[PDB]
Amino acid sequence: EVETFAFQAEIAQLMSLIINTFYSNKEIFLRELISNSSDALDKIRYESLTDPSKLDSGKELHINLIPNKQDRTLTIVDTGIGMTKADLINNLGTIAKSGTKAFMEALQAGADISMIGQFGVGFYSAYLVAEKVTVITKHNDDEQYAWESSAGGSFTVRTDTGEPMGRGTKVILHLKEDQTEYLEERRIKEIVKKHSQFIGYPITLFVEK
Numbered sequence: 001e002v003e004t005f006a007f008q009a010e011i012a013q014l015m016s017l018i019i020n021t022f023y024s025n026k027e028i029f030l031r032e033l034i035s036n037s038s039d040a041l042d043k044i045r046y047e048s049l050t051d052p053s054k055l056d057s058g059k060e061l062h063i064n065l066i067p068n069k070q071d072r073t074l075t076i077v078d079t080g081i082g083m084t085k086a087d088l089i090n091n092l093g094t095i096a097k098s099g100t101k102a103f104m105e106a107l108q109a110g111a112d113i114s115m116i117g118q119f120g121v122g123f124y125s126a127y128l129v130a131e132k133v134t135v136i137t138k139h140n141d142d143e144q145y146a147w148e149s150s151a152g153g154s155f156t157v158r159t160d161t162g163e164p165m166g167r168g169t170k171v172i173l174h175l176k177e178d179q180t181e182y183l184e185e186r187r188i189k190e191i192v193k194k195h196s197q198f199i200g201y202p203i204t205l206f207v208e209k
């Protein structure tokens with residue numbers, strides 16, 4: 001059972017700008033997703049300070065980067081707070097309507113796409129490199145759900161029957177044909193060292209057979 005939703009007009013416009021603007025510095029997508037994961041880990045850590053049972057769904061707080069050349073996917077896994085179904089539908093827990101408004105005013109006033117994270121909509125920078133994005137998520141207060149969009153103005157949400165996650169979020173980037181450099185170990189390490197050196201959680205880059 002799959003529910004199909006229309007993006008709010010402003011979010012559709014944000015995604016088409018990201019997809020269509022000529023902009024070579026695409027590697028910042030990874031910094032934005034890692035920073036989102038760090039924010040989600042901060043949230044569950046703060047909740048656990050006063051309620052240790054919040055970590056019954058998993059005590060480890062970390063970020064994994066899993067490239068898969070056979071599937072042409074890069075997956076960013078975190079064990080953060082996760083998102084409820086309502087969160088997913090409401091622009092993946094972001095204030096994306098007002099953030100898009102500010103971002104596009106900034107762009108016409110000198111800014112570039114790399115500053116997207118300052119406006120709270122850094123998730124959508126995934127579409128700099130991915131033709132499709134799947135988000136699998138589990139929050140302590142809800143069931144496991146899968147969000148998916150190939151842009152084009154709509155997204156789907158369904159209950160996830162895949163491998164149970166415990167708690168957290170998985171962002172699966174189905175990469176564009178000409179963006180497979182982001183599956184190469186040396187390129188991913190370079191980007192993590194350049195842009196994510198002060199993230200306060202272990203970031204593990206998986207290797208492939």
Ligand SMILES: Nc1ccccc1OC1CCOCC1
Binds near residue numbers: 043078082093135
């Ligand atoms: N981790 C994550 C993955 C994909 C989209 C958003 C994400 O973070 C949001 C905002 C911070 O924490 C709550 C959920």
